[PDB]
Swiss-Prot record:
The chain holds residues 34 to 414 of 1040 of the full protein. Belongs to the immunoglobulin superfamily. Contactin family. Disulfide bonds join 28-78, 122-174, 228-263, 305-352. Glycans are attached at residues 43, 165, 171. Residues 10-95, 100-189, 206-279, 284-368 form the Ig-like C2-type domain. It is found in: Cell membrane. This is Contactin-2. In conjunction with another transmembrane protein, CNTNAP2, contributes to the organization of axonal domains at nodes of Ranvier by maintaining voltage-gated potassium channels at the juxtaparanodal region. May be involved in cell adhesion. It comes from Homo sapiens.
Amino acid sequence: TFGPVFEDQPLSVLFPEESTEEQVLLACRARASPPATYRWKMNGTEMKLEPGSRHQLVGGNLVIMNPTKAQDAGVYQCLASNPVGTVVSREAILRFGFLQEFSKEERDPVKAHEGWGVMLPCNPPAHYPGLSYRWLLNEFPNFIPTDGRHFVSQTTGNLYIARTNASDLGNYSCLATSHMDFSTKSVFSKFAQLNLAAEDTRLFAPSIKARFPAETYALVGQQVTLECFAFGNPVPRIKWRKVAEPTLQIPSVSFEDEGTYECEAENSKGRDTVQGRIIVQAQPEWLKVISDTEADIGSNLRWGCAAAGKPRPTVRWLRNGEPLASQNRVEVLAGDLRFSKLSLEDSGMYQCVAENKHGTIYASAELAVQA
């Protein structure tokens, strides 16, 4: 006979607001002898799963009836125990995917001058997760092309023109698109009128008005997009370097791509520059983990775990899914479990828990003290 070994664990779920399914599963199972009983935790609080209930346990599996952001969004964790002891699953995040439509309330007039640079605000509906942004001239689907006189941000979704013309006269609408697992959804706004008053004849050294953060935090492998677009006359040219498009794309980052990046808006009259720093981070991943150990009574044990990733993660310890700190019999150091002479009250499940700002991983094993 033996203690619980996880055969499947809950993974984070993006339940789309809408949906046909009137429920949401969070999987969990463990092989154990005798058969393993299950418990659940939400946001750190334990779950009441009861008879005539809405939070239903189906043999290890958590099934939540009619889920809502306002009631169900959060962090869930499975707990698998039997006479031998408890182990705890990875945390799974339950999030809700939605996109509202723009207000049927008309847009604020945005009037500028010909030759002047002008920004048109998207100001988009409530949404999760992040969106694509395109803009529309007069009708649908009459798209604005991104060419250098035009720029649509993928943060704010605001349209930018560096210099206005006679060709830019018309009505404008922001089209927000959400991409999720089984559905794309595009919503667009009421049409704002761009009025263009008397032509300015003057020239302006470029001013960057679409910047990118002082610092940008990304994981290894992530796509990275820094935005840099500038007002100016004549139409400024975007230049990038490490210390020719307005957005610098990094298809998959390695650690080398860390450092200060510089954007140069430069027309013939001057140059505006902007500097930001990319920090390359990484998830905790298991370098070494504890194994099911069979030990004699009164013996000693050197147990250990270590994890990679930036920043260097912190190794916790759990006994039967309970925060373990150093105590009479047991010694604790970062990722080290030293048993100063074993008792039978040690025969249980143990886990090491490595974690940083980016994630928390788990590794478990059974201790069996024998005579």
